[PDB]
Amino acid sequence: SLQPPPQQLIVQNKTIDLPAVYQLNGGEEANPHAVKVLKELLSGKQSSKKGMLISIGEKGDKSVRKYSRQIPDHKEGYYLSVNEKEIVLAGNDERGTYYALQTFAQLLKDGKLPEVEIKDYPSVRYRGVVEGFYGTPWSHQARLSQLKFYGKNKMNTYIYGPKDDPYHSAPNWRLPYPDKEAAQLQELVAVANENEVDFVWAIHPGQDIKWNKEDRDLLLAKFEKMYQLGVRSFAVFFDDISGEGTNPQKQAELLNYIDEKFAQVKPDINQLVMCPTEYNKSWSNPNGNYLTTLGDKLNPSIQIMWTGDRVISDITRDGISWINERIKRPAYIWWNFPVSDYVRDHLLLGPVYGNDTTIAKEMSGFVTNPMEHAESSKIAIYSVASYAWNPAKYDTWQTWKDAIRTILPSAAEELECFAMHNSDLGPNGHGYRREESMDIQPAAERFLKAFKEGKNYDKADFETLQYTFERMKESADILLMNTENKPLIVEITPWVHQFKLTAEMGEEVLKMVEGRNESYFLRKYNHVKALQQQMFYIDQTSNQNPYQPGVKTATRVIKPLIDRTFATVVKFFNQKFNAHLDATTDYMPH
């Protein structure tokens, strides 16, 4: 696969060997970030003056003069070619050249390259991640890892805005970062730059902002401090606030002032972005003037963010048309998936789907708001990178599989198994849901239907359930022990324990269905109760946050099926043996 998939690809069914001996043409004039990647791939392979030509450069460079007609006339666009005669890596701009190298790195398969001609560019101008959730902000190390992941996947945007950073939100938005954090932010900016990512620093001042000179200057002074740390893109967020800070005329005036006195004054500022107080259709007043005021008054270069029809929603043609009409520019999408900050006891590891794939022209930008679990979020982030670069060719399931295989190549099938059953959010105040456990859902439905009305189940279904529980245990134990991405395993570990126990309870409940005799059934029954108590202990010891504490897993299909089957066979046993066993399914000490 190539991820994201390029706009145009012609494959010749030959392959060649990576030289071997090579002449590098343009390494002194091309994007240093791209040349660095190229030289790492060519490591210990000898440059000379005869032997295979490799030309690298940006449109306008001497090295790629011969290829100027093939270089797409798009921002971040590139032309790549591999044949017998030569290799060409030619960006329309410096970032384009870096992107050619990221595709080239994926083509190279143990010393071999396919013979290809690629013409490529993004459909959406700004693509990336807003760290913009409530909860424990991402660690320094996580963020460093994220930035490298973004470059590899051609995301050009990282918006720093954790709701619970005191120097981002109120009241200490007015204060400069202490030295330690300031130095960390400086290093993030440097790393972002190396990976061709725009570090966008957001401020969230609206809960206690006064519309006076004091707070204006404090804000601009903070932006100046961030500038000194290397920050060249900026945002002001007015989401999830009440009070005078919600005044659209004043917001517009503040943003225009920042634009006019700062964004348009510095030698080298890039994005200026704002998130409105009315940030989705349901939170908007169609009879109020809020969004039309922003649309009319905000300077045309300023971006305006949007989460869709609801706080949590997927982006539709009709939804984006509605906002675009009011804000008088293409919305810069803030997509609230996989963010789990309102369903904190769940991991959301399923595919990225639901967003219209034909509306690239109607958005300025598309960023994902991820989980507080940084590594876990890479499944979705990789998919959003693919979707935003090439929406027309976006393939939900293939990209999910490619994401997982990239993140954990040593145990991809185990991670697929875990992720497929850790997808849904459960019921929530936002009404947002995802599919989960789809493959076994008909087998489950048929198995359980057979019980509630009469009987009896198909053997192949009982066996599918059995196969699933077995596979869930292999997956749980192998992931726990995996050392390729330790940060990821640390993140998911509590859920992995709960997932293993779910599978064991499943196996035990299915032995109760097969109930050969009274005492065997009681042995299984007692084992299930013990497994229920073990799940209860994890739910009360792990992930004990103030909001949705604990650890839920395989909640959509698997846990309901196990629990219902348990209750059913206990019912039957109690009839058959005139017994009074407890049929309840969650352990309660009180």
Ligand SMILES: CC(=O)N[C@@H]1[C@@H](O)[C@H](O)C(CO)=C[C@H]1N
């Ligand atoms: C603009 C925007 O989406 N703001 C917040 C966001 O910070 C929060 O993570 C989520 C997603 O749970 C929704 C909003 N309450």
